[PDB]
Design a protein around this ligand. Structure first.
Ligand code: STE
Ligand code: STE
Ligand code: CL
Ligand code: CL
Ligand code: CL
Ligand code: CL
Ligand code: K
Ligand code: K
Ligand code: K
Ligand code: K
Ligand code: K
Ligand code: K
Ligand code: K
Ligand code: K
Lengths: 48, 243, 271, 244, 194, 271, 244, 48
């Protein structure tokens, strides 16, 4: 996988010159998968 | 820009070079390393494992029979049973062994060798044989008396079926070439000597028993063995590309 | 479940001085190969030895030292300005035989590409031309021509270089879906099929193909390409019995039967 | 006294499930790669369903049909788990599940007399390919419980040297010394688990390297028997029974 | 979740291809549908969100969420069984064979939908996204089948529609991931666009 | 106004061992797609699971990993020693389809230019020539000829390289007047005009043109140029439904109607 | 809220092994004699061999062939473990062992519409004898997975009153109220374990006491489906497979 | 032999880009040479 240690010095003035971002994480997808006002717990029925 | 001066070697492709280079998939995350038995970190672990010597490499022996050293009830004393140069990397009985294959992947070797023999006659078949290592200087010993002056072991057939003759590392230099090719390099300089086997007494059997029996020969590197300078194994070749 | 330890060493074993031994107790020389264990008789127990502080190293036989160098894996010439090479290491025997010394292995690889222009008579030309090597993973569309849209390579990784520049070179990680590559597989490629052609090949070892082209059309000449591969960061398991017969096929280990490995000699008693 | 004097006793007893195997002429016991069978670790696993662990119903000794050590005997081999795919509950669990993982305890038997001589190499080879033919026959790659006869012993059916098969877990049955070989084998694969009907992880071979000979008039009919026990097994991906 | 183009047959055009046909039976244990679960192969899954992104990669891993919504009348009842058959053989031939695998029994009611999780059950940590055989022999990676059968029957009142539809949704579960980016095979062109 | 949190993860979710459940209380399997929410049934609730410490990463699907590689955006040959390319990514479909997976996005870009000389028959030549690529922002005068005064480029940025040197390469920042580029715009380009040709295009996405020339005149040959673009430091918003029909026009998303996406099979009951 | 207000929710989910069953019209869940299945205690056991406990491979839901609620329907019954003796690994473990012990989770399904009326008694009877004939036919005492049709429902096939079958664990499927019945059954016998091929501990009966009727023109084809899961099972006395 | 001191900085993101490993040691070969359950001391007879 990715190296825990490696050179990370910027040689140029503008950030546009920098190499690619190295975060690459993901986030809870709820804003897309469950964009609802009322919480609907997994163990209960959705509608009542 | 920082002033630089590029040097000889620039742009060359040395197959043994060791540089860092951009990855085709910079963010790729490999599968986890799982628990698998038998991890090996160095091939010295492999050459220390005994394997069979194709010792009976004669016209009359084909396939599996080539691993058997013939033994038979004698009617004369002090007779010879077998002979072999101990060099692990030269063409001959040793070339197809584990030790031989890896030695043939290198140009130099060093270390003591383990030659183990297992008697395979009947439980009632007895015998004593002497196995000797003759350090270099002359030709292989011509008789048992000459052979016994060197390093040797006297083996008595019995419950413990096998015996080990250690061919200790006895060399002028710390390493020896793995080939004895003479015409070009004059490497005959490195010959490590001979291993010979003789009847110490005789193979003796009860009435109507098989009067011939076999001995299997194993070889492996000892813990002080090492190899240097990797080279392509001469046994692996091809004409055109395989389809 | 490991009952046998594996301590590491950086040098071979020393020799310690030993003296004579006349006893009924210790019998180092007596062995029993039937147990499956290699003899444990030491030099010091078989003869009288001297002290030898042995500093010989063990580095050149490590997996990294053995495998850590480039070897040819592909060699071809374009046809119509293009060539499709299925990534596999069975065409050229040297590297192939090395890999088969292990059953399983994980490693990254450094690929180096050397290319030049040759004419119809296979004579090399001093001609600098841009070429493109595109890695097409299984499932992706493979270009049919030198100018097909797939060469846009917006997702497939591609390396564009010139025959006038040094050899191209890129590293690749351990890419198998498995936890190690397999250099011996006693099984079939799929369920429901037991044809011989689907035996002995583990599909996960095939990561795709490299398709090569010259960016623009050469006039009567072709691009000659050699691909070298160098294993890196090698981890290996289960040593195997070395190949002892010539290879005959690129995808199978089929061989010609033989009655001997080494050449014959006159007699077993003459070295 | 054995552990005190530093030697291996020639007698042995192997007990698994409802089965017990004994021998009075063993030559120690080999444990492949020094590793006993182990369960799949949570950090190595990938299949998410709770596995089935049959226990004693499958982890016991199964004896296969014997093979005769004939005058022209070249050797015999059995693929694992193929050989037991239709035997007992081990076979049923193997058939009803997509995935299987497990180790083995192998006991090869061959007794003669102190008037006989001969030597068998008993080796367990990981990923042993039967590739002497351009197009391997299914009957030879998966011979089942009957096993298959060797046709190319010198080249180990795979283009390598028979003499180097010693790099794999093995023992020898040298008639003057012992009448049985015992090998404990851990699961080996480049994966956590695999299909028991598409892949054979190990191949057990019994190969005569020193032909069977004997005092004139002695019993000539000498069988070789293989008894194998699955050990530390687990299965995933339950469905209807499926065989290769 | 996105809709699976499950009814991909000659007689179904456009929007109709998203509907799984259900009808009042006059026989028991009948089959309703079948599909390979592989998310990246050509077929009903290729035009889904999951399918498109899976087709942008060479390998995948993870459990899959297959959700179904019944769309008949409030008075229309029924019970169906949805099963996942791990690989090894062919798709199950009947309900008895199918129910031996992973499954869920769905009862039509107020809660209109049901989820069948196709858990990640694989020999390796990842699978290739294509099952292309002729060249790579990737049929090696087949993930299995999902089949649906009548558990009881679709039952309706007098003069009600005797046919109804089920919509099929699919999505990746939280343990799903993809590796090795590759060009999506569905996007192509002849000459440059003007 | 955000009522739904978005915690970050660096690995996929683990599986925890679960046991049987026989109750009228918890019913994870029952769902209601009408709500617009994707099912929340977990593996552990639908079947009995084992513990799986899953360390699979999520890096290769990040926006940076997905978009962070070069793709072809322009390809042309000079005419009269010059070529004017309006900067837009609609000519070559691969990168275009990728970008349309997002509604809005901010990113810097790395442009790489690969050029070579070709003759009238489009055959590549081994000929090193200096070429100039000038970025002409909207409003600046575009040169009509290979030797026009605009090539002085005292303000317009220009990159001068040679076909004998490695590909030229420069980075560009996020240049839109907007706060993000838009890959979908349901509106018109100007007030007072509702013609179809001015629909679906956001003018702020057009930053100008690249004009290319050889510094001096080639004798009978032309300059072939390929421009590649690589998004960097990507920030994206509002995922979109992927393109499911072939592209037909460079500036519009017009398409040919279809009655199916995937190919048909014999019956719905046979997989 | 259900446990708070003191009522039983009409929805239910039953998850065992790789199987999940749901219903939106249940009528609580019956647990026979108020006892959940339990393992054999060391103080009650007699067979000395270590038992096989297959786990999820056998403890999961098996759906049997459906039965039609015809106009002349008298009822249907299934013997346990007989009905599952040839299904999945439960069947295999039952066949390969002399002894078996286990509980059950039974789910009977029958949906119609709010335009239909009818009532089925769903009862699990311990030691239910089919003794209406001088010499009972094996086809009726052990009908297998298909089950057998009732011929004498009023006398419960055993000479007792149908109306008193309520003394055994039961529920009703009254179409206007529910479309399923669920019963959890513990192992019951006068012994710690017994043979699964010679003795059926329980018999599941589905008997129409109020005939199926409906508004004219409604669906007339109404199936009844039984899904059964072995629970907390163990087996002893391993040998070759044997069926009755 | 190998240098006791030398540059060891990674310039790239992925470990696959790194130069060759520099350990190169060997390990006790017992798992291959003596994979037996009962210890058989060098000074004693193997079988009894
Ligand atoms: C864009 C630059 C191209 C560089 C080449 C990339 C190659 C990617 C494929 C890597 C796979 C290597 C492992 C193969 C090992 C299996 C060998 C075999 O069994 O034949
Ligand atoms: C002097 C060197 C020349 C290098 C090229 C500079 C290019 C400057 C323009 C940058 C604009 C890029 C963003 C375009 C995104 C919109 C795409 C589209 O909708 O078609
Ligand atoms: Cl030689
Ligand atoms: Cl010589
Ligand atoms: Cl496909
Ligand atoms: Cl297919
Ligand atoms: K030392
Ligand atoms: K000893
Ligand atoms: K040794
Ligand atoms: K158990
Ligand atoms: K995790
Ligand atoms: K729910
Ligand atoms: K979900
Ligand atoms: K268990």
């Amino acid at each position: 996988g990715s190296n825990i240690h490696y050179t990370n010095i910027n040689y140029y003035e503008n950030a546009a010159s920098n190499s690619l971002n190295k975060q690459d994480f993901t986030q809870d997808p709820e804003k897309f998968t469950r964009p609802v006002v009322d919480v609907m717990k997994e163990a209960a029925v959705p509608l009542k | 820009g920082i002033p630089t001066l590029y040097t000889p070697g620039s742009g060359q492709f040395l197959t043994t070079d060791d540089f860092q280079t951009p990855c085709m998939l910079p963010k790729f995350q490999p599968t986890p390393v799982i628990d698998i038995p038998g991890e090996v970190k160095n091939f010295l672990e492999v050459v220390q494992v005994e394997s069979l010597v194709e010792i009976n490499n004669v016209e009359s022996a084909e396939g599996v029979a080539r691993y058997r050293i013939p033994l038979n009830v004698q009617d004369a004393m002090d007779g010879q049973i077998m002979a072999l140069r101990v060099d692990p990397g030269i063409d001959g009985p040793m070339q197809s062994t584990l030790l031989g294959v890896f030695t043939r992947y290198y140009a130099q070797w060093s270390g003591s060798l383990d030659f183990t023999f297992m008697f395979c006659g009947t439980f009632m078949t007895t015998g004593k044989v002497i196995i000797a290592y003759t350090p270099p200087g002359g030709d292989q010993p011509t008789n048992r008396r000459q052979a016994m002056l060197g390093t040797h072991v006297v083996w008595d057939f019995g419950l413990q079926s096998s015996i080990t003759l250690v061919v200790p590392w006895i060399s002028s230099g710390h390493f020896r070439g793995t080939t004895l090719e003479n015409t070009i390099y004059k490497y005959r300089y490195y010959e490590a000597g001979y291993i010979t086997m003789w009847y110490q007494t005789n193979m003796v059997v009860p009435p109507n028993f098989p009067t011939t029996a076999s001995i299997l020969m194993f070889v492996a590197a000892q813990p002080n063995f090492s190899l240097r300078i990797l080279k392509d194994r001469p046994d692996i070749s091809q004409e055109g590309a395989l389809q | 479940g490991q009952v046998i330890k594996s301590a590491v060493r950086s040098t071979v074993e020393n020799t310690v001085q030993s003296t004579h031994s006349i006893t009924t107790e210790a019998t180092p020389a007596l062995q029993a190969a039937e147990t499956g264990a290699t003899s444990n008789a030491s030099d010091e127990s078989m003869i009288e030895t001297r002290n030898v502080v042995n500093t010989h190293g063990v580095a050149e036989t490590s997996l990294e030292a053995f495998y850590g160098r480039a070897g040819l894996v592909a060699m071809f010439s374009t046809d119509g300005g293009i060539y499709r090479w299925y990534i596999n290491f069975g065409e050229y025997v040297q590297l192939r035989a090395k890999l088969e010394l292990l059953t399983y292995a994980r490693f990254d690889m450094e690929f180096t590409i050397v290319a030049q222009v040759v004419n119809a008579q296979s004579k090399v030309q001093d001609f600098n031309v841009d070429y493109q090597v595109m890695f097409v993973p299984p499932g992706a569309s493979v270009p049919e021509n030198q100018d097909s849209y797939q060469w846009q390579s917006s997702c497939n990784p591609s390396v564009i270089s010139n025959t006038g520049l040094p050899p191209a070179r890129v590293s690749v990680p351990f890419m198998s879906s498995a936890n190690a590559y397999s250099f011996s597989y006693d099984g079939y490629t799929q369920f429901g099929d037991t044809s011989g052609s689907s035996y002995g090949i583990v599909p996960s070892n095939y990561l795709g193909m490299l398709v090569v082209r010259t960016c623009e059309d050469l006039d009567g000449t072709r691009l000659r390409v050699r691909v070298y591969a160098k294993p890196k960061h090698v981890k290996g398991w289960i040593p195997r019995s070395p190949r002892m017969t010539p290879y005959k096929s690129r995808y199978t280990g089929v061989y010609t039967d033989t009655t001997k490995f080494c050449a014959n000699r006159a007699r077993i008693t003459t070295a | 006294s054995a552990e005190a004097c530093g030697y291996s006793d020639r007698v042995a007893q192997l007990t698994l499930g409802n089965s017990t195997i004994t021998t009075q002429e063993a030559a120690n016991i080999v444990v492949g790669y020094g590793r006993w069978p182990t369960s799949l670790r949570d950090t190595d696993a990938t299949a998410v369903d709770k596995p089935t662990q049959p226990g004693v119903s499958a982890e016991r000794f199964y004896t296969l049909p014997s093979v005769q050590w004939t005058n022209s005997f070249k050797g015999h081999y059995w693929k694992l788990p193929d050989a037991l795919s239709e035997l007992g509950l081990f076979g049923q669990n193997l058939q009803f599940h997509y995935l299987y993982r497990g180790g083995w305890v192998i006991h090869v038997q061959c007794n003669a007399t102190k008037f006989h001589q001969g030597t068998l190499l008993v080796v367990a080879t990981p990923e042993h390919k039967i590739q002497s033919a351009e197009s391997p026959a299914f009957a030879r790659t998966n011979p089942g419980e009957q096993g298959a006869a060797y046709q190319f012993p010198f080249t180990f059916e795979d283009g390598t040297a028979l003499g180097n098969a010693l790099i794999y877990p093995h023992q020898w049955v040298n008639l003057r010394t012992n009448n049985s070989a015992t090998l404990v084998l851990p699961y080996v694969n480049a994966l956590p688990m695999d299909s028991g009907i598409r892949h054979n992880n190990w191949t057990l071979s019994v190969i005569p390297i020193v032909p069977l000979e004997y005092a004139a008039g002695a019993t000539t009919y000498v069988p070789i028997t293989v008894t194998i026990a699955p050990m530390c097994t687990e299965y995933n991906g339950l469905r209807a029974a499926v065989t290769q």
